[PDB]
Amino acid sequence: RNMVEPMDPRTFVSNFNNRPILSGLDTVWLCCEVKTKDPSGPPLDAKIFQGKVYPKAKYHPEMRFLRWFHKWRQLHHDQEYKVTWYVSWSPCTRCANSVATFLAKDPKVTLTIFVARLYYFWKPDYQQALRILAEAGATMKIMNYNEFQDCWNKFVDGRGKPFKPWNNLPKHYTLLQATLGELLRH
Amino acid sequence: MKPQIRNMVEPMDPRTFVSNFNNRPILSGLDTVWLCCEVKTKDPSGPPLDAKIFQGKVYPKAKYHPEMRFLRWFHKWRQLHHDQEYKVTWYVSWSPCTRCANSVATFLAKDPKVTLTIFVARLYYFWKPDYQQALRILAEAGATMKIMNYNEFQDCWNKFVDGRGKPFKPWNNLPKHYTLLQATLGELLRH
Ligand SMILES: [Zn+2]
Ligand SMILES: [Zn+2]
């Protein structure tokens, strides 16, 4: 969390709003944190990537993370690392495949993904994207209050001010988390 | 020239139906509940048998909640008709409160020749442990709980709405709402 260029409060509030059916958000935001196996250890690095939802998947923020992280692994000690993502939309199939491929070649990396909104949760291809990541060993969880607050504290230019939840935040969470759980069943 | 459910009921206004069965998962200012029931024999393709529309409010007292009106009506209906197995289906606009759930459960325990399927358009206060528990109380009594999807909304339209020949018109995101609600119901019934 220390020394990213933080995102501004308005960008966060707009892009991490967890209304389940939401139009006019063409942007994906990905905040990531790298740590060692140790939960008593500090963050080693942190990045914020933005990208568009449109199908030049090469520029989806998940793909930018993989490119960044690949280099980061080389330049650091070969050891087990815990990566956490907070992502405003869940990933597309292409990105899931690349992450899956990545996680297969790199078992010293374990990935936890927190998602504000499921992208196209009614469409089978984005449903499969979630299942692809699960099988590759990534956990996926819908963001609830604590994760939004964590993401606010770590990645947003909140200037000491506390996270303020928007209306129906936990209600949206209940719907989305049930839907994620359903999509990952069996 | 054949018998129809719509000839057995006093149909609701299409404006009443669109408003009350809109399946937006988080909806405020909708204090009314509509319950459409149909009674069938063991045969789902059998001729239309009986049907009734009940209305009420979500506020107490529970005694005039449509589910309680149904139970009184149906207790009487069962006496005025031949004894055999019956299957009841409800299309209900909000899911039931705990007091209604407990009363339906006791009814179902005492009349095991009756089974009940409840399709609900929306889960009422699904974030409140009391209304979550109502759902589990009904499931435990053997009621089949499902969320209304397109086919059920259409069937409800055909049978219980004053549509004047006109076809059921889906509102925006009906199937997306369905997915969210059906996952949430499944989760509340399992956990
Ligand atoms: Zn992607
Ligand atoms: Zn009730």
CSV table of C-alpha atoms and ligand atoms in Angstrom, one decimal, chain B residues 33 57-59 61-68 95-101 131, ligand 2:
chain,number,residue,atom,x,y,z
B,33,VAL,CA,-48.4,-7.9,-1.7
B,57,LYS,CA,-49.8,-5.2,2.8
B,58,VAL,CA,-46.4,-6.2,4.1
B,59,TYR,CA,-47.0,-4.4,7.5
B,61,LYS,CA,-51.1,-7.5,11.3
B,62,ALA,CA,-50.1,-10.7,9.6
B,63,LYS,CA,-53.7,-12.0,9.9
B,64,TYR,CA,-54.7,-10.2,6.7
B,65,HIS,CA,-51.5,-11.0,4.9
B,66,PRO,CA,-52.5,-12.8,1.7
B,67,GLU,CA,-50.9,-16.1,2.8
B,68,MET,CA,-53.2,-16.2,5.9
B,95,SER,CA,-41.6,-13.5,-0.1
B,96,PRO,CA,-43.5,-14.3,3.2
B,97,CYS,CA,-42.9,-13.1,6.8
B,98,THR,CA,-42.0,-15.6,9.6
B,99,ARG,CA,-45.5,-15.6,11.1
B,100,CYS,CA,-47.0,-16.6,7.7
B,101,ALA,CA,-44.2,-19.1,7.1
B,131,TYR,CA,-37.2,-12.9,6.5
C,2,ZN,ZN,-47.0,-12.5,6.5
